[PDB]
Amino acid sequence: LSTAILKQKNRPNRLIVDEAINEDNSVVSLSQPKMDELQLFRGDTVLLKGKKRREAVCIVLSDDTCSDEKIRMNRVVRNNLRVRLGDVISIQPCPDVKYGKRIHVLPIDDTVEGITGNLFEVYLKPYFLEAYRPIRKGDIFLVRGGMRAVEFKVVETDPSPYCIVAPDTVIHCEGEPIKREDEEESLNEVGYDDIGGCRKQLAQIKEMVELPLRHPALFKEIGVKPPRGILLYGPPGTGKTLIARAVANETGAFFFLINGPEIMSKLAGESESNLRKAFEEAEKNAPAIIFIDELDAIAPKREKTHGEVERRIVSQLLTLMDGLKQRAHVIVMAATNRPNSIDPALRRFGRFDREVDIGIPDATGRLEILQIHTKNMKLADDVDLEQVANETHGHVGADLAALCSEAALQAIRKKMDLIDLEDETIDAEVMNSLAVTMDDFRWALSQSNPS
Amino acid sequence: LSTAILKQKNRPNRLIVDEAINEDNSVVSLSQPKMDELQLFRGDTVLLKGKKRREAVCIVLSDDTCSDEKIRMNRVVRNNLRVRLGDVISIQPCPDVKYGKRIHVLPIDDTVEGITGNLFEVYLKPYFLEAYRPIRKGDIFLVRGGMRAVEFKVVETDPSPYCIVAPDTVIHCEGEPIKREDEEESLNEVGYDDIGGCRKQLAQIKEMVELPLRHPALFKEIGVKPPRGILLYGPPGTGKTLIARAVANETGAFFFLINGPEIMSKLAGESESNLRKAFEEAEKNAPAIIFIDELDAIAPKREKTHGEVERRIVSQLLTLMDGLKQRAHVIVMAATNRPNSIDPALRRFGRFDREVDIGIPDATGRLEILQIHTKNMKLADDVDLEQVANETHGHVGADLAALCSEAALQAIRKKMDLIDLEDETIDAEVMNSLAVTMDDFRWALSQSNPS
Ligand SMILES: Nc1ncnc2c1ncn2[C@@H]1O[C@H](COP(=O)(O)OP(=O)(O)OP(O)(O)=S)[C@@H](O)[C@H]1O
Ligand SMILES: Nc1ncnc2c1ncn2[C@@H]1O[C@H](COP(=O)(O)OP(=O)(O)OP(O)(O)=S)[C@@H](O)[C@H]1O
Ligand SMILES: [Mg+2]
Ligand SMILES: [Mg+2]
């Protein structure tokens, strides 16, 4: 009703992700009745939009066994789009794709332990030979070559970001293997889905940041100026910084992050350069979102603040906030857990003149969060999160995370007589037996604390 | 029950140290019934793990008189392993030992006062001749040669850290004699055993620091992220720094120490370099433990702190704490006796978000400590520590240490009419007569003070 901006719409080309029949990386299945509706001929190269602004490039074919409003893609494709089976994507005609000049691709470290021989010969040459594949920068794809299957990451393409791999395409694969861990972190980067119990506020954010930038005309037409300063506040630990993350990954804009405590670590005047440098960068690449985390760290009350360089920064900032031209297309977001200590001049109209309170979560919010956290944890069947939710009154996001971490330990703890700290490696059986029992939670619960 | 991680396990090759029958440095006794269980043939060269990460290398033989789950070793071996008779060790097959290229060994100063003649000839040559001994770097071993017995320290081996001494091995013993005192300090280096009345906390430390680093997979498997900031706090003098010591010596990890008061003694900016330098060192050598002693000295409340360079450091640190990547494998530990004066931003989730309170010890704790202290003191038989323990209410670790030091003096005091300060040397008889009577304690006790 007021959460309207969130419920996404039934549209011609929003299709649910079904498991693939055809097993090929560059292939996507569609019902014939659909392919026509979207004016899509066979072997056409298409563009796919996923989550967290991830993109994939594929070739399209008709599947008899595929529902109209469903689409098949393998796990490699589900990965680049960052979607689980049952999620929904945008399909779009990608007609002007150019042939590939040169591509640079590296293998993942934990998929090459063993023989080198020749990676191009054994793996890449055949996978690409006479295939004419579409690929995007930052695609991770798997190639089987006789005895092994190896994962490769598309480091660079000419032309960026996408090209077709033709016979003329020079393929470079020399370099240091990509580290798995980094690419683990990359998958794990926070989306909107990863924040819980903030629907109301999430709405406002999109309404004040995402919307004014994606569709500036709605405001033009109606004849009003969008606000340009948004200040999130909340009792400590409520996913303010966490939202900072989501937006960066999720937003269509050029994003620049500023960390109060990090600014203030610089030499006198070194900070003023960085402060300008940020605002200049943002203008140069507009539309942009500048985000200031822990604002209070750089904007105490000038009157009540002791150091001299210290006031200069509040002044320095104020100036920049004000120095933003209308045509600039920059929204400054920021966040504190102590709003009242921030110099009031910054909350004057035309500066940070919009607030999003990010309060304690209620019963269902806790349940939401608990779900988001445990989504990759090993839990016993006897674990009831609704219970936890109810028993966790006054917890916030960070309190809950802690709770989970604690029970997890307690679980690990129950294996601690079976294991000695000294051992070089752990008995592989027990490892698999390990799970967080509901009892583990009740222990963690018995230990919990105020926010 | 929650101290589970501490109780060590019955295992195939955890054997109790029994006094040796065979008197040789390179020899270890085992029951035949055991030797088989561990697939260990006679004259095999084995690896032995002691306390505080000490290691010894020996040759193994069967003893008829030796219990299955016991092992015999002489005092020289008990010394390199840093164990008293009745302690327990790891025995491990050491199969790939290489022959010794060159070894450098020096004698101990207070074991060579007198004739030189030739140390190699009289002592080393025979002890090694046709023996094929296993030795480790940092072994101290004793050699008898006619009239005298001399102690040698293995300064360097090629290949490090262990090699077999064959006839081909070139032996260098030229140099300045090792100073006894240094090697006294070395034996005395604080282990875990040296801290008393903290079992509960000692547990949490291992649980939070040693465990996440030694076995990162338990958390991976269960799908939780270990915490990376641990803050120890306690009323002054409760072995916070003392634990700092233990961990350094005891840990598997690369360890880097930071002393608040020592950081703050540096020129402006000269501290910031060191702070980074430390965090960089730790990343470079991960897995690592960075330890910050007297944290409050560098992290007062930014709001409540006066100097400018002074806030810059709190900011500087915060940044680094945050700048720690997931893949980094670094746990930051720190300690204060004034937790409440530390800037709260540092106790936010994902920074120092775990506390270990190191509190006053109870009756038995005191008794524990009193034992640990007096372990190398000359005490009369009439001395009842249980008494002391009961009478010392409200004392902490440092209070007790003081007490002992005070009674010791009182004891020395009782010899003070027999002795004049002026004398060049002390009557050697009285020296031996000296011991701390229980009365001495009752005096010290009568003088004691609040913490
Ligand atoms: N609303 C939420 N949904 C899901 N997880 C959350 C939420 N809030 C906090 N968390 C978890 O707790 C961690 C800390 O949250 P942050 O966003 O750093 O808190 P914060 O509100 O920025 O705290 P301050 O004000 O800087 S002390 C996050 O990394 C999440 O894992
Ligand atoms: N738990 C303990 N077990 C054994 N000895 C202790 C213990 N606590 C203190 N001591 C002795 O007292 C000395 C001082 O202890 P420290 O570890 O320096 O105290 P601390 O807790 O670091 O004090 P602060 O907070 O820096 S004033 C140590 O060197 C020990 O000899
Ligand atoms: Mg934050
Ligand atoms: Mg101390």
UniProtKB/Swiss-Prot annotation, chains A, B:
GO terms for biological process: aggresome assembly; ATP metabolic process; autophagosome maturation; autophagy; cellular response to arsenite ion; cellular response to heat; cellular response to misfolded protein; cytoplasm protein quality control. Changing residue 305 to A: Does not affect methylation by VCPKMT. Changing residue 240 to Q: Impairs ERAD degradation of HMGCR and does not inhibit interaction with RHBDD1. Changing residue 243 to F: In IBMPFD1; uncertain significance. The modification N6,N6,N6-trimethyllysine is found at residue 304. It catalyses: ATP + H2O = ADP + phosphate + H(+). Signal peptide: none annotated. Its main location: cytoplasm. The PIM (PUB-interaction motif) motif mediates interaction with the PUB domain of RNF31. Homohexamer. Forms a ring-shaped particle of 12.5 nm diameter, that displays 6-fold radial symmetry. Part of a ternary complex containing STX5A, NSFL1C and VCP. NSFL1C forms a homotrimer that binds to one end of a VCP homohexamer. The complex binds to membranes enriched in phosphatidylethanolamine-containing lipids and promotes Golgi membrane fusion. Binds to a heterodimer of NPLOC4 and UFD1, binding to this heterodimer inhibits Golgi-membrane fusion. Interaction with VCIP135 leads to dissociation of the complex via ATP hydrolysis by VCP. Necessary for the fragmentation of Golgi stacks during mitosis and for their reassembly after mitosis. Involved in the formation of the transitional endoplasmic reticulum (tER). The transfer of membranes from the endoplasmic reticulum to the Golgi apparatus occurs via 50-70 nm transition vesicles which derive from part-rough, part-smooth transitional elements of the endoplasmic reticulum (tER). Vesicle budding from the tER is an ATP-dependent process. This is Transitional endoplasmic reticulum ATPase.
